[PDB]
Structures are given as structure tokens and as C-alpha cells.
Amino acid sequence: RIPLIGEKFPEMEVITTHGKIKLPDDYKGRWFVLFSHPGDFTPVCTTEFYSFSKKYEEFKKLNTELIGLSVDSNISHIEWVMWIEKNLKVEVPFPIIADPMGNVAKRLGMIHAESSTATVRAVFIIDDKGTVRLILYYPMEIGRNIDEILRAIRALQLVDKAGVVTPANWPNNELIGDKVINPAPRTIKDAKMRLGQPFDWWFTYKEV
Amino acid sequence: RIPLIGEKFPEMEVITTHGKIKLPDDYKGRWFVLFSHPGDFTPVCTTEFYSFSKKYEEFKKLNTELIGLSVDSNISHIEWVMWIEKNLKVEVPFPIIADPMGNVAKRLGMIHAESSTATVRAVFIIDDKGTVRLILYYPMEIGRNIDEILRAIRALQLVDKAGVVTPANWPNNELIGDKVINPAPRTIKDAKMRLGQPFDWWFTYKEV
Amino acid sequence: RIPLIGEKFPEMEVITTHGKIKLPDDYKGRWFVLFSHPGDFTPVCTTEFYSFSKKYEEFKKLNTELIGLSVDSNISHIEWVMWIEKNLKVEVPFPIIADPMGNVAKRLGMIHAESSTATVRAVFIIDDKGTVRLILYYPMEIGRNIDEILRAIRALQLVDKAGVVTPANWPNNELIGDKVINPAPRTIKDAKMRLGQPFDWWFTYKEV
Amino acid sequence: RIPLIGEKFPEMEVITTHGKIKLPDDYKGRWFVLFSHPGDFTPVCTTEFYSFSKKYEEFKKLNTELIGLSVDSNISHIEWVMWIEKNLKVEVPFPIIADPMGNVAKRLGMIHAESSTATVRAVFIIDDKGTVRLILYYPMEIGRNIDEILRAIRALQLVDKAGVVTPANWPNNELIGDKVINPAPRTIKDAKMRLGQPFDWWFTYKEV
Amino acid sequence: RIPLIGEKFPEMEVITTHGKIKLPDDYKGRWFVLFSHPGDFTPVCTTEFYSFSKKYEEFKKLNTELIGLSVDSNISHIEWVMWIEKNLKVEVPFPIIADPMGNVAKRLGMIHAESSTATVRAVFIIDDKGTVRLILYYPMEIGRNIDEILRAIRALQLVDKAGVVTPANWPNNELIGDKVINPAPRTIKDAKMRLGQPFDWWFTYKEV
Amino acid sequence: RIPLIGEKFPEMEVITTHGKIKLPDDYKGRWFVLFSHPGDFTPVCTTEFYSFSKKYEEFKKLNTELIGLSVDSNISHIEWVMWIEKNLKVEVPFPIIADPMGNVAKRLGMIHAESSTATVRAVFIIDDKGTVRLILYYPMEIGRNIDEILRAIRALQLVDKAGVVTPANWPNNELIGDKVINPAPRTIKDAKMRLGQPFDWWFTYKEV
Amino acid sequence: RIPLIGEKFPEMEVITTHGKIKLPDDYKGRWFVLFSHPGDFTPVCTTEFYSFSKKYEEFKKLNTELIGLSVDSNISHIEWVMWIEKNLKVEVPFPIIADPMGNVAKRLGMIHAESSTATVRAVFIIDDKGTVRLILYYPMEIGRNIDEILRAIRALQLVDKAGVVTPANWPNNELIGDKVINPAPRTIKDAKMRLGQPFDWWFTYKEV
Amino acid sequence: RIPLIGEKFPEMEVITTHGKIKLPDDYKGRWFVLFSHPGDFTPVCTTEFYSFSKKYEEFKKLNTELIGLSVDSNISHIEWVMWIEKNLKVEVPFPIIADPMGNVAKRLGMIHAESSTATVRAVFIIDDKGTVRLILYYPMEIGRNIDEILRAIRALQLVDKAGVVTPANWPNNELIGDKVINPAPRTIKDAKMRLGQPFDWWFTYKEV
Amino acid sequence: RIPLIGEKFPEMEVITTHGKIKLPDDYKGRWFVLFSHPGDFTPVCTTEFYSFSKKYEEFKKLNTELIGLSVDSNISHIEWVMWIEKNLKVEVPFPIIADPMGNVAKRLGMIHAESSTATVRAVFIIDDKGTVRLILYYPMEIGRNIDEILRAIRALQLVDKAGVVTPANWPNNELIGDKVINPAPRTIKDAKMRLGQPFDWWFTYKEV
């Protein structure tokens, strides 16, 4: 049923421009960003793939793989990738899932009310253990911000490492900038231990 | 049932720090950003409200109102707002919906699998006619990027005005920068009319 | 539910390379051949479209329109048609229905057990009053015989005109060649009236 | 439920002019063409049986057996076969399934909407492993083209042998005649390996 | 649901060697004997039709029409009737219902457990108002006694005329021969009125 | 389903200002008073907590623990407790259950018809074996009488010790004051044994 | 279904020691206390009726009527009342509802898990408009505190008059004694208007 | 469903030795005793009919009709009645309902667990308005007491006339003999009006 | 489900003026008469208990125990028994089942349509093996005839001893007085053996 933050990504086998892929598991110690686009040979989706491929190594340096998805035939994916390689001079280095009929698209709630024929601009961020960490549904008509996906992976990974929480617009928070936040105390014992620290006992910040 | 892009925002009456509000309709020619946060007096949600209130007038200049939401009592909202006004020196100028029991939260799919006691960081963007235009589910542990919400409203509004589509990372697209994209042709007549224009017949760009 | 010989073709509105089309009715005094192919840019489907477009005027002279269908996006149809026009030097003159998600494909039983991602090579022959007259399911891996579709329309139309029935391999039947067959008698009165005519009372042939 | 291309032919035992027959299995390394006709002693069905029996050895040389079927009593089959042997001077050498009540006919979707009392002209092509390979529903009023059934078996068998796909109207394709087609590449690696071959990378042809 | 003695014969339209017939009503002031036989060109059913046609005028003199029924095609009926006319030298003067698929046969409970492909030897006697008066199910393997059907119509008609009841083996009852029986008294008043008449008060006989 | 007098308190794990607590069992030889209040930082609920904390040791001397509950976040509980400690000069020494979403509140029937957003003033008295002994639903708008809860525990405990029953307003009954009542006789043997004692045989009193 | 605070008391007609009574309505501008007891001639229930009848005029001075209820026959009620009048020297002046079978008892959730044969000590307080204002379930074995029921009516009535809320143990609150509490502010406008008043902005007290 | 005391006797039409009878209504101002017996020509049932017919006029003088019932054919009833008239010298003057199949017997719960083939000795007493007043199920093996049925009608009729209640074994009660009893008082007003009359206020007796 | 003649009395445990009783079994070699009355302190039920207690030893001499039942509390039973002992000068020597809520009363079909608050005057006669032998439903308003219950036990016991059947009004049958009846013959062999005995072969009488 549509997956949510905290649930494990559903077991499913998909057919991609790089062969078959077994989806939560073939990426079982990496993060990955599964993202949909309406269709191949549309212009906005092309700018998005250009941007992803140009920024691919920042995705690799954060140990995440990209994997796209659309309701177009896997031959059309190959012809789209070939057009991109030769007109925009960049090679799309990640797999694109072909799902006509939209079975995996419906399973992840990627078909909305405004088109019955194509996905929206969905983005799932799955971590190294396969849990769904972040969900974005952008509409057809505006492209996504790829640097915001990177910013979110950095923050999500820092959370797993340092057991902290990132502030808003991190690492550019207008109150504490680069600094991260201590997870608020759970009992009254723990809370009193942090009294008189800057801001308040529930709002304490460190640096990393 | 959980609303999706294109559907009208569900009729519902809510109780907020500014009184009662009738939700899709009291904002019937403005845009608004309905957004949830886990709970009052948590630190990350505080940085998010600080950032929203500091950037409030850019939201106003785009004709959108902000409206928050959490499973906390409306008295706790008032005490949170008062703490923010006097420690961070800024007045929270938008209403905060109080929903304990989580009835409106469950109706908008804001409760996920990782906490049974609080919303995630959901963001809905509703337009001047009440249709849901954009949906974001950020997890509890990372704060949101508020400038990305603004960027998306700008783009969504430009789409409604000029009947165009924005490229990725607009207005900073690595192929066409500020320029917007012509919606691809629908029939074979229309497609041939655009042959030999830069990129290809489905990928044509103008300026605004 | 899957249509059958004698039933009226189901009311449905489809989106094609020639715009919108209202399917049983926009062809309300013509015959038409609705036919599916697995996907654009596959090789066998290309030879089939070449053959159809080269033989288009024999279809027109029998008052039938062609209309194709596949689970590919309508932009991919336009790009396929453009590739055909410029590599094989022929212009595809009939509409191609775009149905991703496969809603109209499932409704006509065009998805079989051997691929979950594409139609088979289905062929429906609908007459001037919209009734389904003939159904062919060819598999993905062999192309269709287009002259056999023409042969069947000729025969089906002669049946409607002369109230006869065509023999096997007509107009090349190894017993009576060009000649057509009288519909066998229904009662015992009618049967005795035809006794001692060549072959037998149920097997009588004329010429047209 | 009505069988489709790729599914195995349903297990069923039938009573024929040659005794009992166990249907998918008694033909377990041969191909066979199961085909229905409306009824014995109708004229068009007679021309079809004449044509099948005259062409029987081309069916045998392709390792396929013929087997007919109708809602008529098995005594009426024998009397029809005897009439054919002595008026048209040819012996019907294949079994004819007798199914009054129409149980096997309904199971294979051979009864349509235009007669509640007889089958249509259905044709199933089953291969040496029992999978349904091709389905034809011709109406009562036009006879079938038997040479087209042979053409389809030849092509289907060549596909199983050479792992190719036949073009339209094969072996008489107006682009490549006798030549068969290479199955289009599945991944982007495989596609680039075939660049600059005649037609395009998805449309490559050999000879056999 | 299977008709029973006293119920009206179900409305149904059937297709016979004499054209269409509307079954309970086209015989709306006559009696008729609807009877099934397994199939045309079987030997026992032939002797039964011979016997019926030879005795046809005794059926006519009792104001009853005969009408047969089998799961064989109406062309096979005509060919059976023609074989009978020329080998046994008698013309079958009554209609034979053709019902392949067996829809009317199943509706009258004429298909039993010993053959799934043919009716048994059912006999229904319907009167001038359409009520089912008598039901016989003889098996495939023994022919019927036609003089017993006549004997039963005579008795059933005498019952309707004289308000009596016929004894066993009438008109040859081993106690009272030709004589018929008075319907036994219903109340104790009526019973005492008949005391001391021959046999007893419930068993009184007259002559006609 | 809503618990009742005599049933065991439902197994449930709750999150409180003192950590996790496993509810019927962590108190498995003590009594406890589970009680709800509408919300933190409301005035009447504050007076109730003041009164409970001031009288805490009378609760301890009767071997009962207090444990509160509200639909407010556990951080808001801590901030409420801190406000009480420093304005009313008393430390709240018992755990407060945090249940937003109201799952445990709905399970104990603590949400009524007059507010859909907060509990009423429910009071459950559970004994040393975990059975529900007494249930009070006070409305939002009047505070509870805490000395009446103590009076009821004293009486309930005396019942368990001496196998008696307390009179009305005990220990201040206007007929027998401090004295307790003998449980009325169950059979007619037992009843006659108590005849002519003061009041009557069903109404006998002792002292403790 | 079991009534709750805020719901209107269910329409029902009952048979009492004072005749028939139509329950929510015959008391349509008075308050009333409907209360159950296990059974007549039990000792604790007797002390409770004594106490109620002795304090009857304080109930009358607060415009409330008393009405009792038990699963005992209405003749047994009369004999119990007569025993009370002559042994305890007081006349029971209020009606007692007789409900054997327990239909009204089950409808108000007065039968619990510890006896399948008698009610518990339930107490409902209904106001002049028929809404259920307060619910008490005391167990069989301890009698009720009648002065606490009076205290609650006084408070509930003061709430309806002065739009206030009573503190805990009112009119004997250990913080503000006789004084009542202002209902906490609902919006942030209203809250700031009360800043710097004693205790805090949500905790303000007046006198009556 | 099985009728009970107070319900109206179910509408039903029955076939009896006196013709058709419409059961609750043809007796619409008389009382009647509907009674079953296992079967005709059993010995105990014969003694019961003898006794009923001999006492018939006491039944008539109380304005009640008798009507019997058994699962035996109505001819067997007539032959049983005739045997009784001539061996026991008495004429059975009441109707006997014939119900083979037992449809009316099952509807009145007259078939029990000890025989699946015959009724028990059921007795229903219906009054002048058709309500069921008294139900007796005697077993097969003991005959009924007919004078007790008369005694019960006398008492039931006296109740309807004088609004009283008869004592046990009336008119031979060992405490008050012929005298009848006043229906006990319903309210406490009415009860006190009868104090100090003989026996007690609920036990008062008059004479008729 | 409501018990019937021949079924075993349902297992059930009941609470009576003599303690607990396990109902079919604690009487496992005695007969017993379970009988209901509407309520204690009603006048007719009192006369019935007087009569039962005065005749108790005739019940004991037939090896049957009495046991009563009503929807009144077991304390009210004791007070009723005490009133009877001292006003009517007789001690009620049998147990009275207390069933408020009416669970055992509904299980035995003792609540009818004329009062929803009390049983009717039901009488069950159970034998030494626990089978239900006789069922009486007398209405509220007439008392029962206790000598008729005794008469029925005598007859039922004689049946078990001598394998006979008692005539009507036995031992005072107007045809054969004291004499009992031979159970009618079951087969035609047995019947002829009794021909020419007084009355007839099915009606033979002996003496005991």
C-alpha cells in the first residue's frame, strides 16, 4: 500500500536500461534515490536528467545510487539516453526503470489526479537498510531542485552518524548555521540536566 | 482519502491560534502552504518557524498565506509562539492549526510509520482555486528548506501565467538558466511546425 | 468486458497523434481496423506500419480507416512516425492511439500472458454500424499479413451487400473460386426447394 | 478462463471421430491447430475442411496436427465426413471434436454474441510444449484463409529455432523480403554495439 | 427451474424444422407432447420417430400436436427427416426443435448424469391451457412405448371432461375394466352419502 | 473495549515523564490511580495536580501510585511540571502519560461527546492484582475532589481485608458512622442464623 | 450506545414506584440524578437511600430531582420503601425505576464484569436541557458519597451561570478556596490581553 | 416463528374435515382450542377425541370451538371419525385439520425431538380477539386432561370480565377457594391504599 | 435453543435459595419439576407456592424434586419464603432459582410477548435421565393446577415402567377408567396377531 517514512521499501523486481534489478536488495548497503518522471522526450524531464548526470559524483560520494522510472518502454529509454548523450554531450550513468501499465508506479503512489497517463515527479530516498526516509511529489510542470535532494541526503546521513537533527535550511540555518541540534530530552530527569544551556533545555546545539 | 496533485483540497474546518478557519475556502483567491511539524517545543520545528516568520513577506509578495499544523493543544501553540517571540525576537504571524487526536492529520496522510504520536514534516501547496499543487513529506529528523518552497511557488505561479514549464533547478538551470520551456507539442501537425528549433521539436525554450 | 463478434464496439474516448477521437462514433458510417502493436521503435511493428501506409488506399477504397494503438506515449508516436517518414520514405497517414497505463488495451483484451508490459498484435474489424466483426490476436514475434486483413474486409462487405457467405480462401476457393455461397436453408420447406442443385441442398453457389 | 497467448492450453479430455483424446498432452511434442467451425453440413465449413484435408501434408511437414471442433453430435461428424469423402473425393484425415452443450467451446471463448447456438471460426495454434501461440476469431459468414495459418506456423517455428522475429507479410516483406529481424536490444550496452547498422540499432536484419 | 406437474410450461421461443415456434402459446388450445431424444441418426430414436409418424393421426384425433427436441443442429434434423422419408417410406409431419448448447434442454431437466452430451428420452404432456400434466424420463438405451403416451392422453382428457379418475391400466383395469372412478369425498357429510355402495365410500365407479 | 469494574486493566505500554511504563504490570502489587486531564497548561488541571502532589503521601501510605494522562506531548508535560514546581512551589512526583493521537485515551473511553480534542476527567482505580475497581468520568469544567478518591481507596482496601462492605459516606455514615456492614446472606440457611440482630437479617454491622 | 458527557440522555419510558415516567423529558427544565443500586434489601444500598432522603431538600434547592434504579420488581421496591419508612423513620420521596431483565440498565452501561445479575453503583447527572453532565461508576462493595454529588451539581450549575470553571475540591481549593477560574484564552490576541495577571495568562481567577 | 402468549395467532388457511377454514379469523369472536394429536387410529388420541366430543357442550357454553390437527391425510381423518361414531357411539362434532408434510405443525412448534414423524400433544387456547392465551405441550405417551383445559378457559374468561387473577387450583384454592385475587398495586400510592387488608397489600381477594 | 420433548435438559449452573445447583445433573436419578413464576410477592404465585409446599410429599413419593424460578433477586426469594412461612404457616421446602437478567429464563423460552419484565408460568418435567418430558406455558393471570402436574408424573412414570400409554383423563378415562393402553402395533405381522380383541387391533387395553 503506498509506502511511508519508516516502512521498508517494498520488494519488487524491475526491468531497467541496465538489465533486471531487485529493488530494495541489490542496493543493500548503499542509499538510493528512486525518482519518477512523466515521460521520455519531454523537455523538463530532460533538464532533470542532465542535472542528475552532471552531479552524479556528488551522489556517488554520498554512497547513493540514482535510479529513474517512467511509464515508457525500455526501448524508448535507450533512445532518450542516446539523444541526451549526443545533443547535451553527457552520458546518463544510472538505470532507468521501464514500467508501462504502471504497476510499480501505482504501488508507490506515483500516479495522481491530474494525469491518468503518466507519473508525477516523485522522489523516494531509501537508506542503506532499505527504509523509506523522505518522499517528494513534485507536479509535472515544474522541474525538481537536485541540490535540495543532495542537501537532504547529507543531513539524513549526518543524523544516522551523530544521532542529531539538522536545523532548517541546514547547513545554512539563520540561527546556528553549520551547527546541528541535540534530540530533545525524553524524561524529566534528562530535561533538568540541560537547564540553563543556550536557548532552552529542549533546544541545545553542538558542532560537527 | 489522501489528497493528490490535481484534486481539490478537502473541505474541513480547523481551530487555530487565530480562531476558526474554513480551510480550502477562507483562502479562496490566495495560494497557501499548509505544513505540519511533529510538535511544539521541539528544536527543529522551532528553527523552521523562525525561518518562515523571517521570510514571511516573500510569501506575502507571492500572494500565499502560511498555515501550520501539529497534534498539540492550541494552548501549547500559544505558549510556543510566546517563547519564540521573546527568545528569538520575532513574531510568528501566521495561524497554527491545533489537531490533537490527529483527525485532519490522518485525512492528509501526515502520520507515517516511524511515529504513531506525531506528524511528519508534510508540506502542501494549494493554489488560488484550492487545488493541491505540490506535496512534500520530509521526516522528523531533518528540517525543511524554506527557500525551496518559495522557489516552487514562483515556478508554479509562472506556469499558471505564461503557460510554460520550468526547467530543473530553475531559475538556475545549467542549460538555459532563467529561461522557461515550451510545453511539448501534442499532435503531429503541431510537432512539425517546430522542427529545426534549438535542441529539438519537443525541447523549445523562450524567455520571460 | 472483452468485446466479441456481434457486440458493439465499446464507447471510449482516446488520445491519438491526430488529436482526440471518440471511438465507435467518429467513424459512424465507415469501417475501421483498430489494431495494436507492442511498442514504437520496435522493428516488426515498423514493417507493419510501412506495409499499412503503403497499402493505405486499398483500405480507403473499401471505406475503412486504419487506427493503431500501443502503450507508448503520444510524443514517442510522433517521433516514431517522423523516423518512418524520413528513413523509409513514407508518411504514416492514420492516427495512432497512445495508451500508457493500458486502460483501453485491457478493456479490449490486448494484454496477454507472455508480456505484462505491452500489447500483443491484436486486430479488430469494426463495420459502418460499429459492431465488432472479426478479431485477431497475433503474438509479438511474427508480423501480421496485411493483405489478409484486406481480403477479410472485402468478404465481410460482400456479405453485407449480397446476403451471401464467402468460401474458404475466397476469392480463390479450390472448389468454386470467385463464387460465393448461398446461406443454408433454415426450415424444411425452404430446404426441399433447393433439392438436386449442385453439391447439395445446403451447399449452393452463385456468382457476383 | 479464456486462454491467452503464453498460457498453457488447458487440460481437457475430448471425444472425437478418432476416439478419446487428452488434449494438451496427447500432442506433447507436436504442434497442433485446434480450430472450431459453426456446424457440420454447413457450406462454408465444408470448403474449409476440403481445403484443410487437401493441404494436410504441408501441415504434417511442419510437425503440426489438425483438430476440429463443433457443437454437433459425433455421429453427425461421421456422416459429414462420409459426405465429404464421396462428393468432394477427399478423405478428412484429422479428428473432429464433438462438443454439444458447448462445454469446451465456452471454456475457449469460442461462443460469441452473434449466435447463441454455434461457435465462431476460432483458431488456436499450440506448440510442442502446449503453450497457446496465436488466436484467431473469424466470424461465421466468411471462411478462413488456410495458407495464412501455414504461413504463421512457419514463422512461429523459425522464431523458436533462430531466436528472431519475422517481418510483416513474411516471407514477402516489402522492405527485406525473405530476411528475418534481430530482436531489439534490451539494455544501453547492447544497443550501442549495433550502431550504424542498416536502418538503425533497433532494426537490424539477417538472413536464414 | 425444472417444471413440475401443475405448473405452466415455461415461456420460451425455439427454432424448429418448421420455423420459429413460441412454445406454450402457439399451441394454446391444443394439447401437445414435447419429447426429447438423444440425437439424430441414432437407431433407437429413429424407430421412435417412425412409430410417432405412423401413429400421427391418433395424436391428431386427440387434439394433440407432437414436437420433438435434440441437441443436434437444425440442418442435421432436416437430413435425418430426409433419410427417414426415403428409407422407411414415411414423412415426419411434426416439428423437431434444434437446441445445441442445450439451453432449453437444461431448463426442462432433460440432461441427466449418464451423458453430458445428449438429452435422455424425456416426455412432457402439456394440455390446452399450457399446464404440465405428465413427465417421463426414459433412459437412452430403451425406446419408449408410444401407445402408452396415447393411453395417457385419452385418460387425462377424460378426466378434464367427466371430472373422474382413471383406474390402473385403464381402459383395461382388472377390477372395473372400462369403468372410471369417482373422486373420493372430501368432507364427512359427503362421505356418508355414499355408504354401502360397491367397494366402499371412497371407491365408487361409474361408466362413460 | 472500554474496561469495566471487575475486568483486568488492559495490557498496554505507555511513554511518560518518567520513561516507559508497562501499564497493568509495573504496578503489580501496588494499587494505582490512572487519571486523565484535558490538557497541560489549563488552569483547573493545574489545581488538580497541585492537590495530588500535596496529598501524595496519603496516596503512598495506602500503597497506591498516581499516574496521570493527557493528549499533550511529553515535552509539554515536562514544561508544565517545571512551571508548577516554580510557581506553586511543589514538585509533581508521579508520572504523566503522554498520548497524542489519543490511542490509549480512546481505548479507556476517556474521549466523550463534548470535546473531540481532549480527554474528560476520567479516574480509574486499579488494585494490586490489576482489576479495575472504580470508574469516574468528571467533565472538563469542574475539578475533581481528591479526598473522595482517597476515601474510596480506604474503603476498597478495607473490603479486601475484612470481607465487609462500607456504608454510604463512610467513615461518616449517619446510621452507623465508622462501622462497616456484613455482606448479606446468600442462602436461606445463612439468613435465619442472623434473625433478630439489629436492623434486620440482611443489614448487620460490626466494627473494625 | 452507552451515553457520554455532552450527549443527550436517551429517550426512554420507565416504570417507577410513582407510575410511568418519560425519562429525559418529564424533567425538562430541572436537573436530575439518575442513579442505580445493585438491589433492594441490600444493606449498603439502604444506607444510600437513607442518606439521599435525609438530604433530599438540598437536592430540591438546587432544582434537581432524584431517581433511582435497580433490577428488582416494582413490588419489591414498594416493600423496601415501606421497610425504610418504618425502621429508619424516613420516607423515600423520589421515584425508583424497576427494570428486571435490565434493558435500561444495559443501555446505560450499568452492568459490569463483576456481577451478571445486578447493576453497579452508577450515577448520571443530567441538566435542565437533558445533556449528560457527569458519570460515576462506583462498585457494589463501597457506598457512594452523597455530599460529593451535591458538590458537583453546585459546581456544574455555577459553570452554566457564570461561564467559569471550578478548581479542584471547590469550594475548598488549597490555592484559591471559594474562587472560580476564568476559562483559558482561545487565540493569541485574547491571551496577550491577560498577561501579568496572577499565576499566568491561562490561570486567572475571580470571585462570585 | 413459534407463537407465544400475547402474540396473535398466525394467519393461515387450513384444510379440515369440515372444508377450508381461515384460521385466526373464521373464529373472530369466539374462543377456540387448537390442539394436535400424533396420528389417527392411535389409541390414546382416540380416548382424547371421545372425551372432547362427550364434553363438547361445556366447550360450547364457554363460547369456544374445538379444532384438532394431525399429520394424517384428510381421508384418514374421515375414516377415523367414522370408526369412532360406530364403535364408541359418539359423533365427533368439530373439525380436524389435515396437515401432512407438517407445514402448519412446524410453524406452531408442534414437532419435538422424540418423533420426527408426528406432532406431540400440543394445545393452544386462542381468545375472541385471536391472541394466544395458553400453550401446552404434552408428550405422545400420556393423554391430556380435558377438564383442565375447561378449568383454564373458565379462569381466562373470568380474568377478561372482572379484571382479576385466579388463584392456584381455582375454583378450589386451599386458601380462598372460589374467591379470585385483586391484581397487585402498580405504584406506591396505590399500594398504601390497601394496607391492613387480609393477607397483605399485594394479596387481596374478593368474590364473584 | 428452546428445549423440546425428548431433548436433554441443557447443562446450566444456577444460584438458588439452597445454594448453587448444577441443573440437569444434581438430580441425576430423580425426576424434577422446574417451574417459573412471574415474580415474588405477587398473589397468584403465592397461592401456587402454598399449594406446592402443602403437596410436597406426594411429589417426594413419586421421586421428584420441585425447583422454582423467577427474575427476582435471591434476597427477595428469602424474604418471600419468610413471609409465606409466617403468614400462611407453611415452610417452602424446595429451592427457588434466582435469575435476574433472565439468562436461564430466555434459554428455556419462559419470556413471552405479553410481558418483557417477567416469566410466564412455565412448567418443565424432567425425568431421572434428564430428558424433557412435558412442557406447560400457563399465562400470568391464571394459576396452575398442581394436581394435574402430579397426575402427569404418575402417568409418565407408569409409561416408563410398564411400556404402556395412558388414556385421556387417566386414571379416570370415560371408556376404560383405571386401565392403560397397549402401544399400537408397528408392522403388519404384529397387527394381525391382535385381531378381534376389544375395540380394534390398534386399540387394546390391559390393567395394572
Numbering used by the authors:
A (entry chain C), B (entry chain D), C (entry chain F), D (entry chain E), E (entry chain H), F (entry chain A), ...: 5 to 212
What does the primary publication say about this deposited structure?
In contrast, no structural information was available about this Prx enzyme in Sulfolobus spp. Here, we describe the crystallization and structure determination of 1-Cys SiPrx from S. islandicus, a highly conserved homolog (95% sequence identity) of Bcp2 from the closely related S. solfataricus. For TkPrx, it has been shown that two C-terminal cysteines are responsible for a redox-dependent switch between a dimeric and a higher oligomeric state, with the former mainly functioning as a peroxidase and the latter mainly performing a molecular chaperone function. Intriguingly, while these C-terminal cysteines are highly conserved in all other archaeal 1-Cys Prxs, the Sulfolobus Prx6-subfamily 1-Cys Prx proteins lack both of them and only have a single cysteine that is the CP, thus evoking questions about its oligomeric state. The quaternary structure of 1-Cys SiPrx is similar to those of PhPrx and ApPrx. In this structure, 21% of the total accessible surface area of a monomer is buried upon dimerization. In contrast to the ApPrx structure, in which citrate was present in the active site, the H2O2-binding pocket of 1-Cys SiPrx was found to be empty. Taking into account the monomeric molecular weight of 24.7 kDa, we conclude that 1-Cys SiPrx mainly exists in a decameric oligomeric form corresponding to the quaternary structure observed in the crystal structure, and that a smaller population exists of a higher-order oligomer, which is probably a 20-subunit protein. Archaeal 1-Cys Prxs are characterized by a CXDWWFC motif in the C-terminal arm domain. Both cysteines are highly conserved in the archaeal enzymes and contribute to the redox-dependent association of dimers into higher-order oligomers.
